[PDB]
């Protein structure tokens, strides 16, 4: 658990990591007592009665936290990380403005806003193909009507709460783990 939450550096939204946790002593209530979590919503199971399991880790914006949920529509929910409707797990998120925010602008975190098809649940797209928005083809060269598929989050300490980084850890409960 600590190797996913207390990680030194997280991954981007489109390049969300996936940790297969097997053969473990799971203490699901070891972080519920931690009041450092601002968003904590379980969907497929009651939280207090939890006593393979995957852990998806990425960093999104402040307003994008509402999109990680079944049946949500948005830039992150359709082109970056989509959750199935019959989801069985929990979504944990907390503010990390004091970590992933340089004084001159932390442009290391990216996100995808250009894709010609919505992502399937638990789908990962690391495609750097130049998105064609116009009528004439691009042929791997960017320019007018040929934009880059990824965009950079701002992330500065003077940004609003809605535009601050939030580290999200999505737990998916798919008897090797109890």
């Amino acid at each position, epitope marked *: 658990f600590g190797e996913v939450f207390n990680a030194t550096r997280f991954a981007s939204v489109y390049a969300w990591n996936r940790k297969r946790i097997s053969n473990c002593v799971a203490d699901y209530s070891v972080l519920y007592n931690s009041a450092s979590f601002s968003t904590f919503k379980c969907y497929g199971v009651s939280p207090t009665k939890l006593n393979n399991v995957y852990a998806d880790s990425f960093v999104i914006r402040g307003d994008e936290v509402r999109q990680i949920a079944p049946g949500q529509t948005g830039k992150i929910a359709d082109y970056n990380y989509k959750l199935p409707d019959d989801f069985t797990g929990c979504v944990i998120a907390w503010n990390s403005n004091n970590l992933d925010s340089k004084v*001159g*602008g932390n*442009y290391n975190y*990216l996100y995808r*806003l250009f894709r010609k098809s919505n992502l399937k649940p638990f789908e990962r797209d690391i495609s750097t193909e130049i998105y064609q*928005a*116009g009528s004439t083809p691009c042929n791997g*060269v*960017e*320019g*007018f*009507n040929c*934009y*880059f598929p*990824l*965009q*950079s*989050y*701002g992330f*500065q300490p*003077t*940004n*609003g709460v809605g*535009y601050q980084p939030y580290r999200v850890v999505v737990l998916s409960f798919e008897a090797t783990v109890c």
Partner: single-chain antibody
Amino acid sequence: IVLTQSPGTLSLSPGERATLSCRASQSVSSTFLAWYQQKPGQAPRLLIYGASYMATGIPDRFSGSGSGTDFTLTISRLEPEDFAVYYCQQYGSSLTFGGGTKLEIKSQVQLQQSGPGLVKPSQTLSLTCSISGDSVSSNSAAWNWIRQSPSRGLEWLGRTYYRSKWYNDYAGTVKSRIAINPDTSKNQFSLHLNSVTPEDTAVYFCARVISVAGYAFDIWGQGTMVTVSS
């Protein structure tokens, strides 16, 4: 796309709120609406990129909002330092600047310009833009040339960038006589205007465009004044 800003002139006192607007003739589908601040005698300063994302060193007072055709720039608490003209820029199917709103109050990468400021008519205008802190052949960058005159405003001229090879993009207004050549050995890129007229008298700028930063001009140059006189 035609960007029409409103109001044209706004006079306020320190402490009040200035609500600026920028209406486009059609929808900016690429969502690359950028806001700039230009204090008198200086180059434009990137405030907001990509509809609402704030730039480097921009206080929380400046806030971007809007999408499609209506865009608003809301400055919460005004200071005497905010006396400047604010512009509106979009990228996508074209590269158009706004008319400008004159608001009156009652960093590691450096682009340095060089070249002559007095060119005779029917002669070539040459200006060089030295780059330090970033590579002129950067894969995620573009090197543009922009001029500013009270008759046309911020008029974008052209650009050059390097992916696998070198590519060009020129504005049809000056395409018949413009040339932008990069120099990798000196880490520069220069501007050439073949046949100049008194209409070309303006203040020219060179700026950097990062693709992941809303395709907005984030770091501008010194700003040289070229006069076409005989």
